[PDB]
From a paper:
To assess if the introduced amino acid exchanges affected the overall structure and the binding of the oxime, we also crystallized the tyrosine variants in complex with selected oxime substrates. The protomers in the crystal structures of the tyrosine variants are perfectly superimposable with the ones of the wild-type enzymes, confirming that the exchanges did not lead to major structural alterations. The only exception was found for XenA Y183F in complex with oxime 1b: while the electron density of the substrate was clear in the wild-type enzyme—and only the productive binding mode could be modeled in it—the density for the oxime appears less defined in the Y183F variant, and both the productive and the non-productive binding mode could be fit in the density. Binding pose metadynamics performed on both productive and non-productive binding modes (non-productive modeled from the crystal structure of XenA_Y183F, vide infra) showed that the productive binding mode appeared to have higher stability than the non-productive binding mode. In fact, it presents a lower root-mean-square deviation (RMSD) than the non-productive binding pose, which shows a steep RMSD increase over time, indicating poor binding of the substrate in the active site. Tyrosine 183, the canonical proton donor of XenA,55 is also found at a hydrogen bond distance from the Cα of the oxime. Hydride transfer to the oxime nitrogen followed by proton transfer from the canonical tyrosine would lead to the formation of the hydroxylamine (pathway B). The calculated high Kd for oxime 1b clearly indicates this enzyme’s low affinity for the substrate and might explain why this enzyme performed poorly in the biotransformation of the other oximes in our previous work. Both the Y183F and the Y27F variants of XenA showed a non-Michaelis–Menten behavior, with a linear increase of the rate over the concentration (bottom right).
The biocatalytic reduction of the oxime moiety to the corresponding amine group has only recently been found to be a promiscuous activity of ene-reductases transforming α-oximo β-keto esters. By studying the crystal structures of enzyme oxime complexes, analyzing molecular dynamics simulations, and investigating biocatalytic cascades and possible intermediates, we obtained evidence that the reaction proceeds via an imine intermediate and not via the hydroxylamine intermediate. To gain more insight into the reaction pathway, we determined the crystal structures of the two enzymes OPR3 and XenA in complex with the oxime substrates 1a–c, either by co-crystallization or by soaking. All the crystal structures obtained had a high resolution (1.9–1.35 Å) and showed clear electron density features for the oximes.
Author numbering:
A (entry chain A): 2 to 362
B (entry chain B): 2 to 361
The structure:
């Protein structure tokens, strides 16, 4: 089964092609993770996935999405991740982390607590930042302040500091969150970036924040550990042909800047779109990025059945299959997949205290 | 769905009828649980089960099955369970514990490391105790030492101390392990109990260790928290009708002694048996014990599908359905069952960080 072949990238070897993509839990306090996260991540790692990318972790307080988001903006925040890193490794999985800045989508309620921008008189809310003073709209009406050049320098340094903290906490894989309408994606998109300086306008200028952030992180993140990014390559906004061509060109420049693998996603930069949700719908687009930019890729958004995952690997559309919600439903999804794909000794996808009994069940 | 109706026993209310029965993990060291157990129990509790009975926990070192078994024979051992109690409660489940003594089946290798008695030359092993100096046989050939009267008093006190520790660690449900061929079951069974003193021979004498242990635990375990036991009610040894009748009579005595619920199982006292493994096969026997002894019951051994579990409750064969191996496969099995049984807002069987997204 292709899904259960190992994968080597730099000094990291994953035991299979099942990756758990970053999934915010909204359970942190002042950026500090706790026993929610410890059990959540350790249990999924024991389930058999080869790579576990920890949820979007804010590089700065105002870069959280919500008051429940994890942060890594201080050394104390980084130290809180050490037991998570070590528990993932103890389970035989590889610990990664996505470092992030929510941009104009920040200062929002948890999804089950309204999912919308926090009211201005609520002490929990904060002023958001973005390339331009333009609101997302819909449930996120707050207008961000437009970043200064000093803000751009500061946020880049926050990404650098976060990457060095992640390295010292023991993460073996890093993902820069340049997708999903957050700060990096919003610098790239003409919908959200109306700047008139070196960071807006032309393709080079709109790419600049992302390329400079990557280059600054590349200095501090080790060459021997995968340096990855998540990027929304189209918006489903009626501009898909031109946006794909630009996004693929940016992927080529990411590769020239030392990126090892690209997590291919959707932009979600504005609400006025028509995303054609369906099983494995990103497969063909991820394959085009992989082939045209000549970089390994992962993707998500509907690959969460064993056969869909296997087919995407056999078609060389992906190098790793990211399976998110299925792992919230069943932390042992990798074992479920091993059974469904007929892996020999499938129960030994799990540790011995489970595997021994399930072999004979 | 009957499987998702709450259950009240004494002061405890379970959010549904799904119980996770005790399942040894073989991952402790010197009786002390660790990160293996912490994540294992917390994750299953978040999965939605209403009751989580922690694995057989030895009341004394020689009462472990293996060198990896949990213990509660000191106050430090009990404190190690506190974070497990807290995590189970934080998930909205109810924490229970099975306290145990493996008797002649003790001093064995872990199941994936041979599953057999540790050899006499191997310093990891220890001398085992039992009612009589007679081996289980098969893969457990070591002949135990027959307990002295002082040994019997000591083991009873160990059960008392274990129950007191479980109480003060915050467990809300206790289960005495009188099943599965271990010490308590082996006092009851004529196969293993050849004693000629007050603890063997007649029905009263064979029951005595179990009834005295229950009574001693009763003096320390709170009246307002369920006091339960697991007991093998037949062996499938060609003596089933007589063994069932006297096991049910003992259950009546347990009831009179304050037992709140009986986990009905098989004896496993000797290897020479013919157990008819199959889906929900214990249903009819559990129902007979429940009805004849007038005690609430749970059982296991093949109820691990949503429809089998639901059917057993609708038929009033069980009060709680114990689902073991399915929770090792999927620690969110209760959520899987809620979906299968058409529970409204089934995803909210899980906590919010999962439930919100799975609803959509
Ligand atoms: C609860 C939840 C939280 C998420 N948080 C993140 C995140 O922190 N960073 C990110 O890039 N994507 C995040 N996503 C998107 C997922 O990584 C993934 O792309 C999505 O769940 C689709 O994959 P699936 O169909 O296998 O669930 C999240 C998704 C969910 C359901
Ligand atoms: C790994 C494992 C460990 C077990 N440990 C215990 C135990 O500590 N105490 C006990 O009374 N039964 C124990 N059992 C028996 C189970 O509680 C249960 O009766 C059995 O798994 C059958 O239920 P199931 O068909 O739902 O798995 C164990 C079973 C398994 C698979
Ligand atoms: C809908 C696109 O946005 C996401 O997938 C997401 N959370 O839901 C994140 O990226 C959190 C950082
Ligand atoms: C300096 C080179 O940049 C370009 O010419 C360009 N657009 O202006 C593209 O590459 C389109 C993606
Ligand atoms: C023979 C059946 O015995 C069991 O089910 C069991 N473990 O497998 C225990 O009870 C451990 C205390």
């Amino acid at each position: 089964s292709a899904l259960f072949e190992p994968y080597t990238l730099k000094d990291v070897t994953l035991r299979n092609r099942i990756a758990i993509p970053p999934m915010c839990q909204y359970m942190a306090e002042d950026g500090l993770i706790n026993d929610w996260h410890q059990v959540h991540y350790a249990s999924m790692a024991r389930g058999g996935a080869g790579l576990l990318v920890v949820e979007a972790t804010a590089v700065a307080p105002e870069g959280r999405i919500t008051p429940g988001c994890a942060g890594i903006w201080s050394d104390a925040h980084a130290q809180a991740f050490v037991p998570v890193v070590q528990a993932i490794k103890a389970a035989g999985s590889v610990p990664g982390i996505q470092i992030a800045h929510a941009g104009r989508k920040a200062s929002a309620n948890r999804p089950w607590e309204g999912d919308d921008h926090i009211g201005a008189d609520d002490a929990r809310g904060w002023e958001t930042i973005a390339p331009s003073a333009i609101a997302f709209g819909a449930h996120l009406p707050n207008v961000p302040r437009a970043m200064t050049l000093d803000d751009i320098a500061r946020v880049k340094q926050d990404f650098v500091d976060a990457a060095r903290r992640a390295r010292d906490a023991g993460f073996e894989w890093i993902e820069l969150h340049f997708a999903h309408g957050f700060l990096g994606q919003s610098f790239f998109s003409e919908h959200s970036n109306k700047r008139t300086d070196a960071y807006g306008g032309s393709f080079d200028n709109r790419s600049r924040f992302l390329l400079e952030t990557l280059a600054a992180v590349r200095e501090v993140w080790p060459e021997n550990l995968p340096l990855t990014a998540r990027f929304g390559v189209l918006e489903y906004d009626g501009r898909d042909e031109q946006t794909l061509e630009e996004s693929i060109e940016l992927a080529r420049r990411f590769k020239a800047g030392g990126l090892d693998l690209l997590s291919v996603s959707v932009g979600f930069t504005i609400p006025e779109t028509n995303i054609p949700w369906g099983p494995a719908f990103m497969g063909p687009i991820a394959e085009r990025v992989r082939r045209e930019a000549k970089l390994p890729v992962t993707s998500a958004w509907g690959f969460g059945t064993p056969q869909l995952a296997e087919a995407a690997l056999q078609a060389n559309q992906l190098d790793l299959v990211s399976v998110g919600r299925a792992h919230l439903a069943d932390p042992h999804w990798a074992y479920f997949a091993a059974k469904e794909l007929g892996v020999e000794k499938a129960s030994w996808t799990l540790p011995a205290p489970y595997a021994h009994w399930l072999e004979r069940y």
